[PDB]
Design a protein around this ligand. Structure first.
Ligand SMILES: [Mg+2]
Ligand SMILES: [Mg+2]
Ligand SMILES: [Mg+2]
Ligand SMILES: [Mg+2]
Ligand SMILES: [Mg+2]
Ligand SMILES: [Mg+2]
Ligand SMILES: [Mg+2]
Ligand SMILES: [Mg+2]
Ligand SMILES: [Mg+2]
Ligand SMILES: [Mg+2]
Ligand SMILES: [Mg+2]
Ligand SMILES: [Mg+2]
Ligand SMILES: [Mg+2]
Ligand SMILES: [Mg+2]
Ligand SMILES: [Mg+2]
Ligand SMILES: [Mg+2]
Ligand SMILES: [Mg+2]
Ligand SMILES: [Mg+2]
Ligand SMILES: [Mg+2]
Ligand SMILES: [Mg+2]
Ligand SMILES: [Mg+2]
Ligand SMILES: [Mg+2]
Ligand SMILES: [Mg+2]
Ligand SMILES: [Mg+2]
Ligand SMILES: [Mg+2]
Ligand SMILES: [Mg+2]
Ligand SMILES: [Mg+2]
Ligand SMILES: [Mg+2]
Ligand SMILES: [Mg+2]
Ligand SMILES: [Mg+2]
Ligand SMILES: [Mg+2]
Ligand SMILES: [Mg+2]
Ligand SMILES: [Mg+2]
Ligand SMILES: [Mg+2]
Ligand SMILES: [Mg+2]
Ligand SMILES: [Mg+2]
Ligand SMILES: [Mg+2]
Ligand SMILES: [Mg+2]
Ligand SMILES: [Mg+2]
Ligand SMILES: [Mg+2]
Ligand SMILES: [Mg+2]
Ligand SMILES: [Mg+2]
Ligand SMILES: [Mg+2]
Ligand SMILES: [Mg+2]
Ligand SMILES: [Mg+2]
Ligand SMILES: [Mg+2]
Ligand SMILES: [Mg+2]
Ligand SMILES: [Mg+2]
Ligand SMILES: [Mg+2]
Ligand SMILES: [Mg+2]
Ligand SMILES: [Mg+2]
Ligand SMILES: [Mg+2]
Ligand SMILES: [Mg+2]
Ligand SMILES: [Mg+2]
Ligand SMILES: [Mg+2]
Ligand SMILES: [Mg+2]
Ligand SMILES: [Mg+2]
Ligand SMILES: [Mg+2]
Ligand SMILES: [Mg+2]
Ligand SMILES: [Mg+2]
Ligand SMILES: [Mg+2]
Ligand SMILES: [Mg+2]
Ligand SMILES: [Mg+2]
Ligand SMILES: [Mg+2]
Ligand SMILES: [Mg+2]
Ligand SMILES: [Mg+2]
Ligand SMILES: [Mg+2]
Ligand SMILES: [Mg+2]
Ligand SMILES: [Mg+2]
Ligand SMILES: [Mg+2]
Ligand SMILES: [Mg+2]
Ligand SMILES: [Mg+2]
Ligand SMILES: [Mg+2]
Ligand SMILES: [Mg+2]
Ligand SMILES: [Mg+2]
Ligand SMILES: [Mg+2]
Ligand SMILES: [Mg+2]
Ligand SMILES: [Mg+2]
Ligand SMILES: [Mg+2]
Ligand SMILES: [Mg+2]
Ligand SMILES: [Mg+2]
Ligand SMILES: [Mg+2]
Ligand SMILES: [Mg+2]
Ligand SMILES: [Mg+2]
Ligand SMILES: [Mg+2]
Ligand SMILES: [Mg+2]
Ligand SMILES: [Mg+2]
Ligand SMILES: [Mg+2]
Ligand SMILES: [Mg+2]
Ligand SMILES: [Mg+2]
Ligand SMILES: [Mg+2]
Ligand SMILES: [Mg+2]
Ligand SMILES: [Mg+2]
Ligand SMILES: [Mg+2]
Ligand SMILES: [Mg+2]
Ligand SMILES: [Mg+2]
Ligand SMILES: [Mg+2]
Ligand SMILES: [Mg+2]
Ligand SMILES: [Mg+2]
Ligand SMILES: [Mg+2]
Ligand SMILES: [Mg+2]
Ligand SMILES: [Mg+2]
Ligand SMILES: [Mg+2]
Ligand SMILES: [Mg+2]
Ligand SMILES: [Mg+2]
Ligand SMILES: [Mg+2]
Ligand SMILES: [Mg+2]
Ligand SMILES: [Mg+2]
Ligand SMILES: [Mg+2]
Ligand SMILES: [Mg+2]
Ligand SMILES: [Mg+2]
Ligand SMILES: [Mg+2]
Ligand SMILES: [Mg+2]
Ligand SMILES: [Mg+2]
Ligand SMILES: [Mg+2]
Ligand SMILES: [Mg+2]
Ligand SMILES: [Mg+2]
Ligand SMILES: [Mg+2]
Ligand SMILES: [Mg+2]
Ligand SMILES: [Mg+2]
Ligand SMILES: [Mg+2]
Ligand SMILES: [Mg+2]
Ligand SMILES: [Mg+2]
Ligand SMILES: [Mg+2]
Ligand SMILES: [Mg+2]
Ligand SMILES: [Mg+2]
Ligand SMILES: [Mg+2]
Ligand SMILES: [Mg+2]
Ligand SMILES: [Mg+2]
Ligand SMILES: [Mg+2]
Ligand SMILES: [Mg+2]
Ligand SMILES: [Mg+2]
Ligand SMILES: [Mg+2]
Ligand SMILES: [Mg+2]
Ligand SMILES: [Mg+2]
Ligand SMILES: [Mg+2]
Ligand SMILES: [Mg+2]
Ligand SMILES: [Mg+2]
Ligand SMILES: [Mg+2]
Ligand SMILES: [Mg+2]
Ligand SMILES: [Mg+2]
Ligand SMILES: [Mg+2]
Ligand SMILES: [Mg+2]
Ligand SMILES: [Mg+2]
Ligand SMILES: [Mg+2]
Ligand SMILES: [Mg+2]
Ligand SMILES: [Mg+2]
Ligand SMILES: [Mg+2]
Ligand SMILES: [Mg+2]
Ligand SMILES: [Mg+2]
Ligand SMILES: [Mg+2]
Ligand SMILES: [Mg+2]
Ligand SMILES: [Mg+2]
Ligand SMILES: [Mg+2]
Ligand SMILES: [Mg+2]
Ligand SMILES: [Mg+2]
Ligand SMILES: [Mg+2]
Ligand SMILES: [Mg+2]
Ligand SMILES: [Mg+2]
Ligand SMILES: [Mg+2]
Ligand SMILES: [Mg+2]
Ligand SMILES: [Mg+2]
Ligand SMILES: [Mg+2]
Ligand SMILES: [Mg+2]
Ligand SMILES: [Mg+2]
Ligand SMILES: [Mg+2]
Ligand SMILES: [Mg+2]
Ligand SMILES: [Mg+2]
Ligand SMILES: [Mg+2]
Ligand SMILES: [Mg+2]
Ligand SMILES: [Mg+2]
Ligand SMILES: [Mg+2]
Ligand SMILES: [Mg+2]
Ligand SMILES: [Mg+2]
Ligand SMILES: [Mg+2]
Ligand SMILES: [Mg+2]
Ligand SMILES: [Mg+2]
Ligand SMILES: [Mg+2]
Ligand SMILES: [Mg+2]
Ligand SMILES: [Mg+2]
Ligand SMILES: [Mg+2]
Ligand SMILES: [Mg+2]
Ligand SMILES: [Mg+2]
Ligand SMILES: [Mg+2]
Ligand SMILES: [Mg+2]
Ligand SMILES: [Mg+2]
Ligand SMILES: [Mg+2]
Ligand SMILES: [Mg+2]
Ligand SMILES: [Mg+2]
Ligand SMILES: [Mg+2]
Ligand SMILES: [Mg+2]
Ligand SMILES: [Mg+2]
Ligand SMILES: [Mg+2]
Ligand SMILES: [Mg+2]
Ligand SMILES: [Mg+2]
Ligand SMILES: [Mg+2]
Ligand SMILES: [Mg+2]
Ligand SMILES: [Mg+2]
Ligand SMILES: [Mg+2]
Ligand SMILES: [Mg+2]
Ligand SMILES: [Mg+2]
Ligand SMILES: [Mg+2]
Ligand SMILES: [Mg+2]
Ligand SMILES: [Mg+2]
Ligand SMILES: [Mg+2]
Ligand SMILES: [Mg+2]
Ligand SMILES: [Mg+2]
Ligand SMILES: [Mg+2]
Ligand SMILES: [Mg+2]
Ligand SMILES: [Mg+2]
Ligand SMILES: [Mg+2]
Ligand SMILES: [Mg+2]
Ligand SMILES: [Mg+2]
Ligand SMILES: [Mg+2]
Ligand SMILES: [Mg+2]
Ligand SMILES: [Mg+2]
Lengths: 126, 146, 206, 50
RNA sequence: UUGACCUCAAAUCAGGUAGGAGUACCCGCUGAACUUAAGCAUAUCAAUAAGCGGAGGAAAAGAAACCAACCGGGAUUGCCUUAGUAACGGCGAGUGAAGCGGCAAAAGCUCAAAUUUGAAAUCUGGUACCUUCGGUGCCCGAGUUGUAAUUUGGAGAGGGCAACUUUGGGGCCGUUCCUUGUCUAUGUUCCUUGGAACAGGACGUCAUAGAGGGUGAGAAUCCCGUGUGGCGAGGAGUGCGGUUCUUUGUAAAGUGCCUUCGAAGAGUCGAGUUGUUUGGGAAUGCAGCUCUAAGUGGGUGGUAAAUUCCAUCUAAAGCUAAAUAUUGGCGAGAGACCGAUAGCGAACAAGUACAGUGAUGGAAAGAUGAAAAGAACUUUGAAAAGAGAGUGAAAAAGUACGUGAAAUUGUUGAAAGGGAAGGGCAUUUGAUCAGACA
RNA sequence: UCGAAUUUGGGUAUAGGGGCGAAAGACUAAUCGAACCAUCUAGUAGCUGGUUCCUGCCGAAGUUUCCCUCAGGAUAGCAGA
RNA sequence: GUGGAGGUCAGUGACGAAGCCUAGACCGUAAGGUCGGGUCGAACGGCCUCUAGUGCAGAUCUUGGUGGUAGUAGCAAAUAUUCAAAUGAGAACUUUGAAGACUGAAGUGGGGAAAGGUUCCACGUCAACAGCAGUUGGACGUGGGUUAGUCGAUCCUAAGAG
RNA sequence: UAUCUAGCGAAACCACAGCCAAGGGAACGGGCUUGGCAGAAUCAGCGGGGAAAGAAGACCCUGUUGAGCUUGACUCUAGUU
RNA sequence: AAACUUUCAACAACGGAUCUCUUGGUUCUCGCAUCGAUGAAGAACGCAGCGAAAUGCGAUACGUAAUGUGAAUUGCAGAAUUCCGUGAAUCAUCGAAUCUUUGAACGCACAUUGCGCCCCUUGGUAUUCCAGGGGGCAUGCCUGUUUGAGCGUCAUUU
């Protein structure tokens, strides 16, 4: 139940905000949940995906697969795992587009900032 | 366009009236806005009480002189007789009317006693600093009904 | 109000083998020549276009109003009307359903639901939930997307956390005796809302 | 015409430069939506009116 | 001869201000006709549209030359009402206010006319320094053809007498207000259908969070958010809460009594006439021309005049918040609203493309799929393409792309037809089908 | 008709109750007994045309009177409820 | 019978909603209602109420789409064409050579003003266009190209503007 | 030219349509009634008919509809005296 | 009997109705007060490694400076030194700048990339001519500064 006078339940206002969201906003929209292990490891539930993270597809056809995020394709609202790809007729390979909400994070890529973030949310780390 | 046994009506709609229709859609709006406006004035105004002291007054004409009714301000005579000056009575939340004249003793004693009871039932904080928080009674009209 | 009328379109008069609506003037665009203004023309003004000074609200006599809500309260007893209204109430102690005043002071949702269940509301809370449907109409994309049933009405005397504990459970509505609203006492003008009266509230009724 | 002002020769220059087909690479962009050049002009079909 | 004064000039003189835009709402000017009157000229539309000048966040109005006639009221604005009334009106058609009462908001004042005359006490500019929205010193200049203090009708001023009572200007930190940043619950466990589970079943958890959107199909618990709170950042500012430094002062103000006074706006008020306007009627406002006052005067008192009274304000100079307005602008929350021939003309490279000498006119046009996975390769072909293949859940989705009606068309099948066709009741024949037996 | 009251380019002036007219109401951008553009404007229309589902019950008038009335109104009458 | 709104049936649905098709079935006097099958792909209905931008054959109705007409009218002004080679998938129409003709310097020749604005030139090239065609083009694609003390403008004045 | 061919390919118009005689009928029917009759599918011509097509009759009347123009028609007006 | 015409159906055409969609429209309400000579609004021409347009910008040209984020951008190429970092980004924010030709539009004109004047400076043997660089010159009005005009007019000279 919305209660502030500055949230809008308007379904049109929302969809516009999502599709027209700027790159910086999509980073946080493209959040993946950490894996069971990593969650008790960091006291933290999920994190904005980033490139050299390690991930396991826990939904869809590529259920079970895993790999490193090759590129975050913020434009496409889609993340690409280099290891999860299509071959074509002409043999050629092509990335599949994956969504962070259907992935799980297994090994983080830690920055000075990536840590301070985990601590900003109230986590612990190794 | 005259027919049947109907009362002759006078519906003045021959100018471009549809141009000047005022629907008070903002009726609930402006009440919410008026309530908030007073809740801010209340808080700006320290423990002072939103309104000023109004006098008794006998309503004009042969139709309303039975009733008595809050007037504008207290006349220079009543203010003096009740023992204070015009200039100061204003800073004490008392409304003074330089225009009203006193011709009726009854009303006169009435308002001078109205000023006594007002003075006796307020407290005027010092100019210094202290500001001994004493919580606002909100009207004054309600406090000293007519 | 300016819709349909953003044209300087004239009739062509008769004598041109073509019907005599106003028509767009000029050339080079294929709008040029098309019927205009008319309520039967593509692009025209509509017939008797809607206006904001339509009567929206309605005056009901204050007293007729009370009679209505009084009556709506009266029938929150009468087991049959409540059943006939939806409202799975076969397994409740009695009607009216008066509950301990300790209900008004419950702060936490899970503890609230758990008592509602304890006193018999279980089946009705389940009617909602098992009933949420995608609204059939175009309303479904006009901020009226889902749909559901109406749960019990919990009437309190003093709000001490109860209104916040229940707010987020589907279908349950809370109300303060001194108020009381015909729209909840009789949703969609059917009588017999399942009401759980706190005891404090029950006595204040009188 | 055949001995013009710079203002006119300039307008024609900007004209020329708009008379080109679509740069085909655009057709490939994500969410691309432009199919052909819909403002293409031709000297013997639509005169530019100075 | 030299120095002023008055009035008038010039500078690429020192510093500034005006234009233009926009215009929803606001202050003015100007100003129709369609229309209504079943004709029409007065009237009406309308003191409206078009035209012109000027402002603001509001504008304007505003501290009574007011309303009244009462036991009187007491700036303005606005609502509810007064009232479709008083009144105006080829008294036709039509028109049409105000006082009182309730309410919203409230707030009050300052010039002119005075001898500072034992001291122009006042002020722009330059300049140096400073604690720079400003202060100080100094110097030009303004100003006596009057710049300050004092006073504003409610008063008030000069005398004389008698007593009390009261304060100014800074720092600095908060709060307040404005802009902002970040963080803050709970399943992705099993089974089934599926290309995809976000679907049904099973077992759970959170809930001051089951608003909403995203994600391969209806997702509280997958993601972002929501709820509740927490931690910050940058501003503004004298509202007020704290503090703290200067004492501004031989300063300024309030009140009682006695005495003398008591200045109060002119080509204006007013009057004639003309025109316009108004419900305003022997004339409601406004303007033009002519006439033009007074001081126990002047104005008003909704029927002209003469006389006598009475009531009531104080014009011809001025400022001022709120309640009020708002089809514009900036930012937000919404809807028993429209759903691509609808809704704004425009959901799209739409005020586009196109037309016109120009003023102007002004369209059409959304949807493959979860994903291009947008068809490798073979074969026939000059090519486009066809045929295989291949992708896909599906090509009964192939960038002619969701569904894909109708008119209309090709093919196939059946049937009828000697100047139309189609229809009614009825039955033969052919085709086709329900139900009921038990 | 064809050496001039000749033909013609460019520039320039005249603008809508106005222009220009060796005069035809001619010409004034395919527009002229009053140009084009927008707006007042959804101008008015006693006249013309159209006015969208089913069934059930009842069921007319073209006559009276007055009308600048005679292709229209009011009035009574007939009709339904 | 339709669009939307309150209530309810814990209604239907990706194991196929809505829609569309169907000289198949059934209910109603009728407006209509129900079902089967096929196509289809994400929503939708019954009942009590509420609500209106709520029902079409017509309006020389609005917008869009489509016929009969009909392979029809027609593609006849400007004297006119022909033989071969080359190219090309393809040649009445391109290119070359040969012939026959025309305009007949008051030009169908050689330049310019106004107007266009790249049509000029080259290379490539035929989906549309050039009312037969096309290998050609003023088409399409891709490039190149306009050199000034003396040629113009710029300066002057004209009617006139201001 | 038409006409036959190859390529290219419109428009008007269209309630449904297309054989007559008489009758009656809104007083000149393709349809209705009674007769005559009546056989696929077609090409070139043709101007009898389709009261053919082309424009909501310019004539004529009606409308309490206009407008250009005139005048001792009503009512005014710039100007002028 | 074909053909042809007609009717029904299946499959294929034509056409885009229907159903379901919706970053749009429409209406209501709340909050707020900010264009311009410090050159606005509007116009023109330009600007990317590969752009015609839309959007954005101005020869510093899909951007420069700053600040927050904390690793993209992505149609292709690309740089690679930018990933425990004064640091990715077609990011957000925006307080600093650049801001052609114009426009109230201001040296004059303007169907002209037309024609003057002044100052500083540089080169050409140059205060004077030519060329490059910089900075300037519209109108009305107010206050003041300076320089003036008039038997308008006061005094003061010998
Ligand atoms: Mg929050
Ligand atoms: Mg966030
Ligand atoms: Mg986070
Ligand atoms: Mg991206
Ligand atoms: Mg995705
Ligand atoms: Mg009657
Ligand atoms: Mg009215
Ligand atoms: Mg009218
Ligand atoms: Mg409003
Ligand atoms: Mg309000
Ligand atoms: Mg108040
Ligand atoms: Mg009294
Ligand atoms: Mg009274
Ligand atoms: Mg204090
Ligand atoms: Mg309108
Ligand atoms: Mg119009
Ligand atoms: Mg026609
Ligand atoms: Mg139309
Ligand atoms: Mg419309
Ligand atoms: Mg209408
Ligand atoms: Mg009632
Ligand atoms: Mg709980
Ligand atoms: Mg659930
Ligand atoms: Mg439902
Ligand atoms: Mg709906
Ligand atoms: Mg729907
Ligand atoms: Mg529907
Ligand atoms: Mg030339
Ligand atoms: Mg043009
Ligand atoms: Mg031109
Ligand atoms: Mg100067
Ligand atoms: Mg202006
Ligand atoms: Mg104006
Ligand atoms: Mg007028
Ligand atoms: Mg009108
Ligand atoms: Mg009338
Ligand atoms: Mg009339
Ligand atoms: Mg009439
Ligand atoms: Mg008339
Ligand atoms: Mg009227
Ligand atoms: Mg008038
Ligand atoms: Mg009006
Ligand atoms: Mg106007
Ligand atoms: Mg203001
Ligand atoms: Mg402003
Ligand atoms: Mg205000
Ligand atoms: Mg006064
Ligand atoms: Mg008053
Ligand atoms: Mg009356
Ligand atoms: Mg009347
Ligand atoms: Mg009036
Ligand atoms: Mg009125
Ligand atoms: Mg009152
Ligand atoms: Mg004040
Ligand atoms: Mg004093
Ligand atoms: Mg003074
Ligand atoms: Mg599964
Ligand atoms: Mg979904
Ligand atoms: Mg979805
Ligand atoms: Mg659903
Ligand atoms: Mg969701
Ligand atoms: Mg949900
Ligand atoms: Mg939840
Ligand atoms: Mg949630
Ligand atoms: Mg969550
Ligand atoms: Mg800031
Ligand atoms: Mg006065
Ligand atoms: Mg006179
Ligand atoms: Mg006037
Ligand atoms: Mg009178
Ligand atoms: Mg008058
Ligand atoms: Mg008097
Ligand atoms: Mg008198
Ligand atoms: Mg009085
Ligand atoms: Mg003043
Ligand atoms: Mg004022
Ligand atoms: Mg608005
Ligand atoms: Mg709201
Ligand atoms: Mg909104
Ligand atoms: Mg549209
Ligand atoms: Mg349509
Ligand atoms: Mg509609
Ligand atoms: Mg349109
Ligand atoms: Mg869209
Ligand atoms: Mg568009
Ligand atoms: Mg335009
Ligand atoms: Mg355009
Ligand atoms: Mg187009
Ligand atoms: Mg689709
Ligand atoms: Mg489509
Ligand atoms: Mg898709
Ligand atoms: Mg798609
Ligand atoms: Mg193969
Ligand atoms: Mg094969
Ligand atoms: Mg194939
Ligand atoms: Mg499937
Ligand atoms: Mg399918
Ligand atoms: Mg296929
Ligand atoms: Mg499909
Ligand atoms: Mg394809
Ligand atoms: Mg399709
Ligand atoms: Mg025959
Ligand atoms: Mg039969
Ligand atoms: Mg049996
Ligand atoms: Mg005239
Ligand atoms: Mg005229
Ligand atoms: Mg004139
Ligand atoms: Mg024309
Ligand atoms: Mg005229
Ligand atoms: Mg023209
Ligand atoms: Mg109409
Ligand atoms: Mg008539
Ligand atoms: Mg008529
Ligand atoms: Mg009936
Ligand atoms: Mg009968
Ligand atoms: Mg008469
Ligand atoms: Mg008559
Ligand atoms: Mg008739
Ligand atoms: Mg009668
Ligand atoms: Mg009867
Ligand atoms: Mg419905
Ligand atoms: Mg469908
Ligand atoms: Mg079928
Ligand atoms: Mg069938
Ligand atoms: Mg059946
Ligand atoms: Mg049937
Ligand atoms: Mg049945
Ligand atoms: Mg079926
Ligand atoms: Mg089926
Ligand atoms: Mg289906
Ligand atoms: Mg779908
Ligand atoms: Mg339902
Ligand atoms: Mg109903
Ligand atoms: Mg309708
Ligand atoms: Mg019909
Ligand atoms: Mg029908
Ligand atoms: Mg329809
Ligand atoms: Mg139809
Ligand atoms: Mg029809
Ligand atoms: Mg009909
Ligand atoms: Mg039709
Ligand atoms: Mg046809
Ligand atoms: Mg052919
Ligand atoms: Mg032929
Ligand atoms: Mg011919
Ligand atoms: Mg020939
Ligand atoms: Mg010859
Ligand atoms: Mg050969
Ligand atoms: Mg030939
Ligand atoms: Mg030969
Ligand atoms: Mg030869
Ligand atoms: Mg010859
Ligand atoms: Mg010659
Ligand atoms: Mg010759
Ligand atoms: Mg020649
Ligand atoms: Mg040449
Ligand atoms: Mg050209
Ligand atoms: Mg050349
Ligand atoms: Mg060539
Ligand atoms: Mg071809
Ligand atoms: Mg061509
Ligand atoms: Mg051709
Ligand atoms: Mg061809
Ligand atoms: Mg080319
Ligand atoms: Mg080129
Ligand atoms: Mg020369
Ligand atoms: Mg020159
Ligand atoms: Mg002049
Ligand atoms: Mg022939
Ligand atoms: Mg032959
Ligand atoms: Mg042929
Ligand atoms: Mg041929
Ligand atoms: Mg032709
Ligand atoms: Mg045709
Ligand atoms: Mg018919
Ligand atoms: Mg027929
Ligand atoms: Mg016959
Ligand atoms: Mg016979
Ligand atoms: Mg006969
Ligand atoms: Mg006939
Ligand atoms: Mg016979
Ligand atoms: Mg034959
Ligand atoms: Mg024949
Ligand atoms: Mg004939
Ligand atoms: Mg014919
Ligand atoms: Mg005619
Ligand atoms: Mg007509
Ligand atoms: Mg006339
Ligand atoms: Mg005429
Ligand atoms: Mg006469
Ligand atoms: Mg005469
Ligand atoms: Mg045989
Ligand atoms: Mg059928
Ligand atoms: Mg379509
Ligand atoms: Mg639709
Ligand atoms: Mg969708
Ligand atoms: Mg909306
Ligand atoms: Mg709101
Ligand atoms: Mg570009
Ligand atoms: Mg871009
Ligand atoms: Mg920028
Ligand atoms: Mg780039
Ligand atoms: Mg690096
Ligand atoms: Mg940094
Ligand atoms: Mg940065
Ligand atoms: Mg950015
Ligand atoms: Mg620069
Ligand atoms: Mg800029
Ligand atoms: Mg100039
Ligand atoms: Mg220049
Ligand atoms: Mg010049
Ligand atoms: Mg030098
Ligand atoms: Mg030298
Ligand atoms: Mg320069
Ligand atoms: Mg001066
Ligand atoms: Mg001087």
């Amino acid at each position: 139940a919305k209660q502030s006078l500055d949230v809008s339940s308007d379904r049109r206002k929302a969809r516009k905000a999502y599709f027209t969201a700027p790159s910086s906003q999509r980073r946080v929209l493209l959040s993946a949940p950490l894996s069971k292990e990593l969650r008790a490891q960091y006291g933290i539930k999920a994190l904005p995906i980033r490139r050299d993270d390690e991930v396991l597809v826990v939904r869809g056809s590529k259920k079970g697969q895993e790999g490193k995020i090759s590129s975050v394709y913020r434009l496409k609202f889609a993340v690409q795992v280099d290891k999860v790809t299509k071959e074509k007729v002409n043999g050629a390979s092509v990335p599949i587009n994956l969504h962070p909400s259907k992935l799980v994070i297994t090994k983080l890529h830690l920055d000075k900032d990536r840590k301070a973030l985990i601590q900003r949310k109230g986590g612990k780390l190794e | 366009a005259i027919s049947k046994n109907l009362p002759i009506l006078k519906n003045h709609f021959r100018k471009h009236w549809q141009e000047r229709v005022k629907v008070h859609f903002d009726q609930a709006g402006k009440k919410v806005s008026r309530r908030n406006a007073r809740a801010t004035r209340a808080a700006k105004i320290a423990p002072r009480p939103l309104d000023l002291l109004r006098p008794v007054v006998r309503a004009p004409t042969v139709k309303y002189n039975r009733k008595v009714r809050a007037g504008r301000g207290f006349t220079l005579a009543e203010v003096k007789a009740a023992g204070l000056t015009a200039a100061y009575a204003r800073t004490i939340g008392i409304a003074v009317d330089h225009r009203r004249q006193n011709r009726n003793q009854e009303i006169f004693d009435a308002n001078v006693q109205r000023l006594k009871e007002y003075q006796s039932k307020i407290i005027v904080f010092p100019r210094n600093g202290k500001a001994p928080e004493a919580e606002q009674v909100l009207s004054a009209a309600a406090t000293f009904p007519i | 109000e300016k819709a349909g009328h953003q044209t300087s379109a004239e009739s062509w008069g008769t004598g041109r083998a073509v019907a005599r609506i106003p028509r767009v003037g000029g050339g080079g665009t294929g709008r040029s020549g098309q019927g205009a203004f008319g309520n039967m023309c593509r692009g025209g003004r509509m017939f008797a276009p809607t206006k904001t000074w339509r009567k929206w609200n309605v005056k009901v006599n204050h007293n007729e109003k009370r009679y209505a809500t009084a009556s709506a309260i009266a029938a929150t007893a009468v087991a049959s009307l409540v059943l006939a209204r939806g409202h799975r109430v076969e397994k409740i102690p009695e009607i009216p359903l008066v509950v301990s005043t300790d209900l008004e002071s419950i702060q936490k949702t899970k503890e609230a639901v758990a008592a509602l269940k304890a006193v018999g509301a279980h089946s009705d809370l389940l009617k909602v939930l098992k009933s949420k449907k995608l609204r059939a109409g175009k309303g479904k994309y006009r901020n009226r997307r889902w749909t559901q049933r109406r749960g019990p009405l919990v009437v309190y005397a003093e709000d001490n956390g109860i209104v916040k504990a229940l707010r987020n459970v589907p279908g349950v509505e809370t109300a303060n005796v001194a108020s009381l609203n015909l729209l909840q006492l009789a949703p969609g003008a059917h009588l017999g809302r399942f009401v759980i009266w706190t005891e404090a509230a029950f006595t204040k009724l009188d | 015409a055949a001995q013009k002002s710079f203002r006119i020769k300039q307008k024609m220059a900007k004209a020329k430069k708009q008379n080109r087909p679509l740069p085909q690479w655009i057709r490939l962009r994500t969410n691309n939506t432009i199919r052909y050049n819909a403002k293409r002009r031709n000297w013997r079909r639509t005169k530019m009116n100075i």
